[PDB]
Nucleic acid binder design. Structure first.
Ligand SMILES: [Mg+2]
Length: 577
DNA sequence: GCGATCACG
DNA sequence: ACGTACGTGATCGCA
């Protein structure tokens, strides 16, 4: 039972409560709050938001850091409230982040899924209540109120068991000192948004519609026929049946036309280079011009991403609607998209700071590999040094092709090395790749010992860990299926590296936000892209940021090798290079 | 809805 | 003998 309240009472404002501030729309930016539930020592309450959020005592309670709240996905509530000019403080327990740290593979995305981890089933999945996709809707008040009170009651009854298990895992500080403070910082970043130069985007797309038409007509002429270049089935028929190009592959999905296949097919027909170019331009038009403009707010011309903090299996963030972690940079034609990402105020600039080789520096630290540690203590070009070691040549004798192949070896080492995977990447034989790998481990025997030991540890304990005690369970490590077991072995090798790098930049974000506040700088974090942080600030703060941001990022943790941070700034994101 | 594809670190 | 590089999200075509 619970109270369907018509007005806020003092009983509802106790100094510890489970709080539900329900936002049903997936994108919570400027979205409605459909209902509120409070569970505390005095009872269970459902409040209508138009009543509660207009009540000064309830708003003061929400903003009082000394009034502690337990929630699920507090960032969603905090951001929805920010759009209403209401501050949420005092969130001491977030069940979504607790569940994520205990086991990221559960895919916990609602209270019911977290509750099932502790045999609590007296709450419905959100999808059962609201529906999926187009059939989605807020139910009538009796159904909605019971659901919100059941979620608040579940949070109330799950905080202790979840904290107990986090404690046993030595993850309690990871929740309270890393993920929960980070959630508030991410909320600020998403709410600030990034300003988009939409007229430049519209022009850029224009440059693109003309070039697409040009290459599309060239492809039709070369194919001797007009067809749907973007259809995988149709392209494969044109290439491999009409034009009779060679098929170097498997499976029975018609034919693969991925860029790695087309790059090998290019010497056989002029059409292949044009299809690759058409693919590049069409990706920019559909995803990064048209798709971006769809989610720009028409009034402010800002995009407000949502950073999913409880999704990836390694501890990284992800970014949605739009994804601001995969904006084009590698080819110049795509890189120009970043000219459309601009500071949100006049006379401000974009400032970008990135870790240099954080994953291999983490590997040097965790493996305690003498040669790799010394390479970073000398601040060597790690791919040139790896080439020197594996091909047994002096620095002057490293050719560009040697550095390229050594770089691919380094990628494989971080991903979880295999002769098959390296051979596929470098387009060489498994035996040739195995020789590269053997040479690598002769030069980096500590890395070899580390990789052997971490796979054995994953088998023994059932999971692997990161520097700050994030965990990933790997039950497939004991599979008698070669493919299944090999997947788990690569995850055992990769997750402590990628995940520790994620831990470090998350701590850097917390440290940076604190330093920006101490210095009373106007600079603000806008984005994180795995190993880099993107800020905007007044032009008059650039000199201070050039010293502050790299130092904070470099000092976030202390490893057996230095951390190194590069930085750039300019008038647009493109120019911060 | 799902696989293929390609964008990023 | 075995055959996938690690981690993500958006779009498209097609069933
Ligand atoms: Mg970098």
């Amino acid at each position: 039972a619970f109270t369907l309240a018509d007005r806020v009472t003092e009983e509802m404002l106790a100094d510890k409560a489970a709080l539900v501030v329900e936002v049903v729309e997936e994108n919570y930016h400027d979205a409605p709050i459909v209902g509120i539930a409070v569970v505390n020592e005095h009872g269970r309450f459902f409040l209508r938001p138009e009543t509660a959020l207009a009540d000064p005592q309830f708003v003061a309670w929400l903003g009082d850091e000394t009034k502690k709240k337990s929630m699920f996905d507090s960032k969603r509530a905090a951001v929805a409230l920010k759009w209403k000019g209401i501050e949420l403080c005092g969130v001491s327990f977030d069940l979504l982040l607790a569940a994520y740290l205990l086991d990221p593979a559960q895919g916990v995305d609602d209270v019911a899924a977290a509750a099932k981890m502790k045999q609590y089933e007296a709450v419905r999945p959100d999808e059962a209540v609201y529906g999926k996709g187009a059939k989605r809707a807020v139910p009538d008040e009796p159904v909605l109120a019971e659901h919100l009170v059941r979620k608040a009651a579940a949070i109330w009854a799950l905080e202790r068991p979840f904290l107990d298990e986090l404690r046993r895992n030595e993850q309690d500080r990871l929740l309270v000192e890393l993920e929960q403070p980070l959630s508030s910082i991410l909320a600020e970043m998403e709410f600030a948004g990034v300003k988009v130069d939409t007229k430049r985007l519209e022009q850029m797309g224009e440059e693109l519609a003309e070039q697409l038409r040009t290459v599309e007509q060239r492809i039709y002429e070369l194919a001797g026929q007009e067809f749907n270049i973007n259809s995988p089935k149709q392209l494969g028929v044109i290439l491999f049946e009409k034009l009779q190009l060679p098929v170097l592959k498997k499976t029975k999905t018609g034919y693969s036309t991925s860029a790695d296949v087309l790059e090998k097919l290019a010497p056989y027909h002029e059409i292949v280079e044009n299809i690759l170019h058409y693919r590049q331009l069409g990706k920019l038009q559909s995803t990064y011009i048209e798709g971006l403009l769809k989610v720009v707010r028409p009034d402010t011309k800002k995009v407000h991403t949502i950073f999913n903090q409880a999704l990836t299996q390694t501890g990284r963030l992800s970014s949605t609607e739009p994804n601001l972690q995969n904006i084009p940079i590698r080819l110049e034609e795509g890189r120009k998209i970043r000219q459309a990402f601009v500071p949100s105020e006049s006379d401000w600039l974009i400032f970008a700071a990135d870790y240099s080789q954080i994953e291999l520096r983490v590997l040097a630290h965790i493996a305690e590999d003498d040669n790799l540690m010394e390479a970073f203590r000398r601040d060597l070009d790690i791919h040139t040094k790896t080439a020197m070691d594996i091909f047994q040549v002096s620095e002057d004798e490293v050719t560009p092709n040697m550095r390229r192949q050594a770089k691919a070896v380094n990628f494989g080492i971080v991903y979880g090395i295999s002769d098959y995977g390296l051979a596929q990447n470098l387009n060489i034989s498994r035996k040739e790749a195995a020789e590269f790998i053997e040479r690598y481990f002769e030069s980096f025997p500590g890395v070899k010992r580390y990789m052997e030991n971490i796979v054995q540890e994953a088998k023994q304990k059932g999971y692997v860990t990161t520097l700050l005690h994030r965990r990933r369970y790997l039950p497939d490590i004991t599979s008698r299926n070669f493919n299944v077991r090999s997947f788990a072995e690569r995850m055992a090798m990769n997750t402590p590296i990628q995940g520790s790098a994620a831990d470090i930049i998350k701590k850097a974000m917390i440290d940076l936000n604190a330093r920006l506040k101490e210095e009373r700088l106007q600079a603000r974090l806008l984005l994180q892209v795995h190993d880099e942080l993107i800020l905007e600030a007044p032009k008059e703060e650039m000199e201070r940021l050039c010293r502050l941001v790299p130092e904070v990022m470099e000092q976030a943790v202390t490893l057996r090798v230095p951390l190194k941070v590069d930085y750039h700034y300019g008038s647009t994101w493109y120019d911060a290079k």
